[PDB]
Amino acid sequence: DVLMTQTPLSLPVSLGDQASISCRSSQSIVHSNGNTYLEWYLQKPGQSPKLLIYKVSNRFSGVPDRFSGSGSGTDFTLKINRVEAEDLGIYYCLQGSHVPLTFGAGTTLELKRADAAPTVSIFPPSSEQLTSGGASVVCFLNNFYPKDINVKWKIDGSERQNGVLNSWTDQDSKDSTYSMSSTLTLTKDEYERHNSYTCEATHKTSTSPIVKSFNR
Amino acid sequence: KVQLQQSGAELVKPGASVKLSCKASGYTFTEYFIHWVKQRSGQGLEWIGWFYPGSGSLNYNGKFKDKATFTADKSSSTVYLELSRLTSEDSAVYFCASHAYDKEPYWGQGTLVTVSAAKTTPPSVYPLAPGSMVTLGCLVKGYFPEPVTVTWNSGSLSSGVHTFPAVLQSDLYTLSSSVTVPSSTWPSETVTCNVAHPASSTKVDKKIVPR
């Protein structure tokens, strides 16, 4: 199959910036009929992808003229002349010249802001959940930037992997940060047989993790 | 105007099949291609195949040959995607797209497919109280289906709130919501999470009290 390689994976931009993003195909995508079916899409959360550019360089009807596409052969580029807030989202390229049709993996345009360490908070199981026989330990890693982050759970000094579920917010509309929630679920029995519970946040803003803990 | 109307969200039992529809208008039905595209939550776009109602011609991405079947009903300008023997990996949004040969495509709004054996179940809501600012939370566990609506203090507390996307575990959804307030406001004032679940027609409150 034709491999579509998009770069960069993510692009932080400020409003008014020039943006340029690239799509390279693993082989030529000139169709036998002479056309190059290369398209660019912008997708926002919860919406269908919206067509921006078709046949390499043609703007789809209604698309702002700040968007432009170019390229030839295996080498394609989408440019935005002065980014606006509605341009933030994920951009995909698509080749329609050789079946199976194939998409790039996406380039995320996100809003740039100052790097920020997460605010980390840990919560032991509620007595209500315990009475019901369950035990969830919740860790919030809030308002950090950039979006990449890692969480590690420790029970009595030992790393725990099973029973951990994570969830991430989209970039915050007001402060441009990201947040993450991590939940460690246990049976009530196992939870009462240990003492210290620890969630560790590793983020680029520091060399050492931010560590939060409690004891039963 | 070219328009594609896709069928509503589907809740599908594991192992069962489901048939999604895309109903077209605004053009000569037999002269446009229909494509289907899959998108798993938080992931990229995958092409499933193309179908040309005007001849019955089709092509599947080999990755989907044992999973997807295209058919059409010309008498209603509808094309169908049937997905067989659903697994967790089949949970996704499915888009249809239509175009004439050498012309730009029009996309439908997508159909969400969720695989679970669960029946309608209201959430259990648990307070998250800590062991200049303070962070509180609510854990919303074991409900089906999506969505729930979480508010704090009946909506009067909206800033500093993060409600996280739900995750499906053992066929039921769990999510958490955090709120951050000045320490001068809690516990001296009431902070309550409210959780509405339309499918079960329930709404419950949980006041956050110190441990």
Ligand SMILES: CCCCC[C@H](O)/C=C/[C@@H]1[C@@H](C/C=C\CCCC(=O)O)[C@H](Cl)C[C@H]1O
């Ligand atoms: C989600 C995909 C949307 C469509 C992508 C692109 O716009 C379509 C490209 C088409 C190309 C690929 C699509 C279908 C193959 C049909 C071959 C046939 O006519 O037998 C054909 Cl060759 C012409 C061109 O219009």
